[PDB]
Curated annotation (Swiss-Prot), chain A:
Section covered of the full-length record: 98 to 146 of 1454
Protein name: Mediator of RNA polymerase II transcription subunit 14
Assembly and interaction partners: Interacts with GATA1. Component of the Mediator complex, which is composed of MED1, MED4, MED6, MED7, MED8, MED9, MED10, MED11, MED12, MED13, MED13L, MED14, MED15, MED16, MED17, MED18, MED19, MED20, MED21, MED22, MED23, MED24, MED25, MED26, MED27, MED29, MED30, MED31, CCNC, CDK8 and CDC2L6/CDK11. The MED12, MED13, CCNC and CDK8 subunits form a distinct module termed the CDK8 module. Mediator containing the CDK8 module is less active than Mediator lacking this module in supporting transcriptional activation.
Tissues expressing this chain: Ubiquitous.
Compartments where found: Nucleus
Superkingdom as given in the UniProt entry: Eukaryota
Function: Component of the Mediator complex, a coactivator involved in the regulated transcription of nearly all RNA polymerase II-dependent genes. Mediator functions as a bridge to convey information from gene-specific regulatory proteins to the basal RNA polymerase II transcription machinery. Mediator is recruited to promoters by direct interactions with regulatory proteins and serves as a scaffold for the assembly of a functional preinitiation complex with RNA polymerase II and the general transcription factors.
Family as reported in the entry's similarity comment: Belongs to the Mediator complex subunit 14 family.
Swiss-Prot record, chain B:
Subcellular location: Nucleus
Reported function: Component of the Mediator complex, a coactivator involved in the regulated transcription of nearly all RNA polymerase II-dependent genes. Mediator functions as a bridge to convey information from gene-specific regulatory proteins to the basal RNA polymerase II transcription machinery. Mediator is recruited to promoters by direct interactions with regulatory proteins and serves as a scaffold for the assembly of a functional preinitiation complex with RNA polymerase II and the general transcription factors.
Protein's name in the database: Mediator of RNA polymerase II transcription subunit 7
Subunit organization: Component of the Mediator complex, which is composed of MED1, MED4, MED6, MED7, MED8, MED9, MED10, MED11, MED12, MED13, MED13L, MED14, MED15, MED16, MED17, MED18, MED19, MED20, MED21, MED22, MED23, MED24, MED25, MED26, MED27, MED29, MED30, MED31, CCNC, CDK8 and CDC2L6/CDK11. The MED12, MED13, CCNC and CDK8 subunits form a distinct module termed the CDK8 module. Mediator containing the CDK8 module is less active than Mediator lacking this module in supporting transcriptional activation.
Taxonomic placement: Eukaryota, Metazoa, Chordata, Craniata, Vertebrata
Gene name in the database record: MED7
First-to-last residue of the parent protein present: 79 to 156 of 233
Amino acid sequence: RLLALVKWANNAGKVEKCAMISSFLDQQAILFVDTADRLASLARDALVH
Amino acid sequence: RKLNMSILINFLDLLDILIRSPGSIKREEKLEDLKLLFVHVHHLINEYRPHQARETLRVMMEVQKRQRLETAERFQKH
């Protein structure tokens, strides 16, 4: 099982780049939902008063 | 009318923000920006509210005057 580990040690950096990609795309999805959320908080809270 | 069109064009520019660069600083400004526009669209039409108030007094007075004369004429016919 240590041999399997040191085999995968060549494939480590690609998974590091994949984690970077996944974090970036999750951040942009949170940006979309935050824009829609702040527009809802405009339209239902501040303008009613 | 200017503020209506400005609200729609700033919504389109917010769509351009969401297309091009969602991580930009400007969207926070943009999500503030049209808010300010919406405030002004309320703040102008609230300025129609005293005027409307004064104007309803005027038409009430006119209707009041007319009804008096109508009763007068009605009674005189009787």
